[PDB]
Nucleic acid binder design. Structure first.
Ligand SMILES: [Cl-]
Ligand SMILES: [Mg+2]
Ligand SMILES: [Mn+2]
Ligand code: NA
Length: 192
DNA sequence: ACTTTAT
DNA sequence: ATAAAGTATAGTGTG
């Protein structure tokens, strides 16, 4: 079965709306809303925008103030096909998502992992994990998540997952498939 | 590459 | 004036 991993570039403007989904202030049921779990040691009340800025500001090497259009984090999505989460119990659910969080902690840094919101109230159990691209005193997604790196991630991470009792396969190498938005993909299934 | 941002 | 970092990527499926 296919291992699904995809980041989206997250700036201050769109971090408003991304935080506004990740915690609740219409494809969801409120009956399943609880039980959902956060996988970092972050303060529930504090927003991502405030957490990350201050984490960078205090840790950044250069004195040049943070640019307005900066990539503050990269909300990676970890999920798979529905046949995968069926053969998984409730405590193996936690074990699956924690190895995902770990891969990005082992290769890209521990306190870089700003959040890890797990959603069980949508169609598939999926984690929204936001990785801050802070390395060598620099904040750059351009330098951390480049062309070379995402090819490695698509190769290495599923093979890392297969070292932990889970049975997956990497997505089709050198794919030609273009990302369809949730609204687009829904419509892409309205006709067949 | 080429362009936008903060020195 | 300078220069690090913005744009993309890579992958699947009801994010
Ligand atoms: Cl649902
Ligand atoms: Mg047809
Ligand atoms: Mn969600
Ligand atoms: Na390609």
């Amino acid at each position: 079965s296919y291992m699904v991993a995809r980041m989206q570039k997250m700036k201050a403007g769109n971090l408003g709306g991304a935080f506004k989904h990740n915690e609740r202030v219409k494809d969801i049921n409120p009956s399943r809303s609880h039980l959902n779990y956060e996988l970092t040691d972050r303060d529930r009340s504090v927003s991502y925008e405030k957490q990350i800025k201050d984490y960078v500001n205090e840790n950044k090497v250069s004195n040049r103030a943070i640019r307005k259009d900066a990539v503050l984090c990269d909300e990676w999505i970890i999920t798979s096909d529905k046949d995968f989460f069926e053969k998984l119990d409730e405590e193996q659910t936690r074990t699956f998502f924690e190895t995902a969080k770990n891969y990005f902690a082992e290769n890209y840094g521990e306190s870089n992992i700003a959040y890890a919101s797990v959603h069980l109230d949508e169609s598939t159990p999926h984690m929204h994990m936001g990785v801050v691209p802070f390395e060598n005193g620099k904040l750059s997604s351009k330098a951390m998540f480049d062309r070379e790196e995402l090819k490695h991630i698509q190769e290495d991470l599923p093979r890392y997952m297969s070292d932990h009792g889970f049975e997956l396969e990497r997505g089709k190498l050198n794919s030609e498939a273009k990302h369809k938005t949730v609204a687009e993909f829904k419509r892409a299934m309205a006709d067949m």
